[PDB]
Design a protein around this ligand. Sequence first.
Ligand SMILES: Cn1nnc2cc(CO)ccc21
Length: 131
Amino acid sequence: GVTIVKPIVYGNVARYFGKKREEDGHTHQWTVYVKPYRNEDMSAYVKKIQFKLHESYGNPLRVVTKPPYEITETGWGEFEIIIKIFFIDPNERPVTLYHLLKLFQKKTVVSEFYDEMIFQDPTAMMQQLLT
Ligand SMILES: Cn1nnc2cc(CO)ccc21
């Protein structure tokens, strides 16, 4: 059979403001993302990536369809973000990732994980799109 492995990295970077912010108490800017391990345009084969934030955010289900696959926000809190990757072939099961937003230990805060999206015997059309 055919196995196509698409390596990815996901997670977040964060920047401390320098001071807590009086008007909302946010302390950090952060960006949560998915990106390919090697430079490729994932929109060849990815329909959309959903980023589900803590429900205390407005419009906590954030959707990106065009790279880069990232969401930039501010806040004070750390919580899991559910990252769901949907494919152009609706018969390819979506990939669900789970990421704990990291804001704390000058140096940019980074928490980034490697993973692999495995396509076992895709349609010939989806094969072309993955290669
Ligand atoms: C959980 N958390 N952390 N920081 C937050 C900021 C907002 C929007 O002001 C909502 C929820 C937040």
